[PDB]
Amino acid sequence: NAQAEEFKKYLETNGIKPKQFHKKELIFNQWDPQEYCIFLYDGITKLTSISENGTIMNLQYYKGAFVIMSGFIDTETSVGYYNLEVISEQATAYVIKINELKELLSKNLTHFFYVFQTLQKQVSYSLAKFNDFSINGKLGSICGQLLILTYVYGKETPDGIKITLDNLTMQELGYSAVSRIISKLKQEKVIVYKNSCFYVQNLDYLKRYAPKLDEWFYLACPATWGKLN
Amino acid sequence: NAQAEEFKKYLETNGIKPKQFHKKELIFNQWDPQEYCIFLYDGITKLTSISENGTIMNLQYYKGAFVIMSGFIDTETSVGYYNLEVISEQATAYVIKINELKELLSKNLTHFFYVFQTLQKQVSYSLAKFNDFSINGKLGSICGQLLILTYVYGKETPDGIKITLDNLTMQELGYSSGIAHSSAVSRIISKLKQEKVIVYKNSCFYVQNLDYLKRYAPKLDEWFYLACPATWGKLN
Ligand SMILES: Cc1ccc(Cc2cc(=O)n3c(c2C2CC2)SC[C@H]3C(=O)O)c2ccccc12
Ligand SMILES: Cc1ccc(Cc2cc(=O)n3c(c2C2CC2)SC[C@H]3C(=O)O)c2ccccc12
Ligand code: NA
Ligand code: NA
């Protein structure tokens, strides 16, 4: 995004520098009382919650460029006990204490609005995910995840649309009730495992079962959506 | 709500008058090419969608005071094909075209922050609902809906925590977001009643086992504590 590049310049102009993280690192964590604004510039992360018995809940995936805030902009207190875990091999992020951010959002309104609109994109993402699950259950969820991966990481090859992700990252994303759905899908030549990669061969099927996420992508990321429509 | 009362004052200072709506009216709709910022001041609404075959989907509930924006602040285009439907008898709202909300928030960062933090509360709300559904399924979803009803509208009495909402409105709200009046949800709710988690007495409803709701909606309970600590505190 150009809006993302301008935000990066704005931060680096104000002496906030990028930080590199490696896979499994927590950019912020649920036990930390200091809250942050993360500008995820590059890489893939997941928002988790860890219960007292140790079970890890995967709540949300984010890719750069995006903004993730662990605290409320006004109170500076936590919005939820969450970790931001790196799942790509490396990720680059700008890490801003929440108080320090208020100063900088204020001087510039273009950049205030860039962060505002990322929140709006998150809200409508969650509602669309929910709408697709209410209609089509787990098939909807899984079709939705494959759809966004196709739009974002897909590449045209003679074998279909290849999802061009490191095979290690694919494992981090989930690639017994899920086992059976992924089975039906290749069982119907919607997806295929060739060359140890992952190819989509019936993109219309994915659009059919994740209609509201498809609409979200159209409305919120139209230039990308347009590559495959 | 002090921050919201100040916002209302800021809108009237810039000449924006409130509008009144009635139950079943749409404050904004999915077909309108112009997108709006709604400052819901009083009353209860729901965000709805429609699928190809005409099925109404209830996505989200909102109560005054709150902000609901139908379009992106920068591009001014739709965030999704949604309607905002009034479900209380009446509702009062301020309706601002999206391009103007931008001037208004640029002129006063106190009010910018008020709206920004409204979005932050929505984001965290949806993640907590997701988490509770992941752990406890639809029972988690229903317990959380009743938990927030209790915190927001509940008043401690000798018979338990009375839900201070007319019986009409309050049965609709017992059904979490989804398809209206489903058999599965009606059974979950009546099971909670059979087990005396929420009970009918003298024309009113009383939550008598708040701990049970907290047990099955722990992440929405934490969300309310983090987002609305003074209201959470009153009943804990
Ligand atoms: C499988 C999958 C589904 C979902 C998202 C979320 C996403 C993706 C996305 O490309 N975008 C957004 C999100 C949601 C803000 C969160 S907001 C608009 C756009 C953007 O990034 O600018 C993924 C992100 C990373 C990796 C995998 C993901
Ligand atoms: C039963 C029930 C459960 C759930 C919500 C949602 C809610 C409620 C709520 O009280 N609040 C929020 C929400 C979700 C942002 C939307 S954000 C913080 C707080 C606030 O409004 O200030 C209700 C809203 C209206 C009526 C009933 C509701
Ligand atoms: Na934290
Ligand atoms: Na609209």
Curated annotation (Swiss-Prot), chain A:
Residues 136-204 form the HTH crp-type domain. It comes from the Bacteria. This is Listeriolysin regulatory protein. The keyword GTP-binding does not apply. Signal peptide: none annotated. PROSITE patterns: HTH_CRP_1 (PS00042), HTH_CRP_2 (PS51063). Keywords: Activator, DNA-binding, Transcription, Transcription regulation, Virulence. One of its GO terms (molecular function) is DNA binding. Changing G144S: In prfA* mutant which constitutively overexpresses virulence genes. Presumably blocks prfA in a cofactor-independent transcriptionally active conformation. InterPro entries: cNMP-bd_dom_sf, HTH_CRP, RmlC-like_jellyroll, Tscrpt_reg_HTH_Crp-type_CS, WH-like_DNA-bd_sf, WH_DNA-bd_sf. GO terms for cellular component: cytosol. It comes from Listeria monocytogenes serovar 1/2a (strain ATCC BAA-679 / EGD-e). Positively regulates expression of listeriolysin, of 1-phosphadidylinositol phosphodiesterase (PI-PLC) and other virulence factors.
From Swiss-Prot, chain B:
GO terms for cellular component: cytosol. The keyword Plastid does not apply. Changing G144S: In prfA* mutant which constitutively overexpresses virulence genes. Presumably blocks prfA in a cofactor-independent transcriptionally active conformation. InterPro entries: cNMP-bd_dom_sf, HTH_CRP, RmlC-like_jellyroll, Tscrpt_reg_HTH_Crp-type_CS, WH-like_DNA-bd_sf, WH_DNA-bd_sf. Residues 136-211 form the HTH crp-type domain. GO terms for molecular function: DNA binding; DNA-binding transcription factor activity. Keywords: Activator, DNA-binding, Transcription, Transcription regulation, Virulence. The keyword Disulfide bond does not apply. Positively regulates expression of listeriolysin, of 1-phosphadidylinositol phosphodiesterase (PI-PLC) and other virulence factors. This is Listeriolysin regulatory protein. It comes from Listeria monocytogenes serovar 1/2a (strain ATCC BAA-679 / EGD-e).
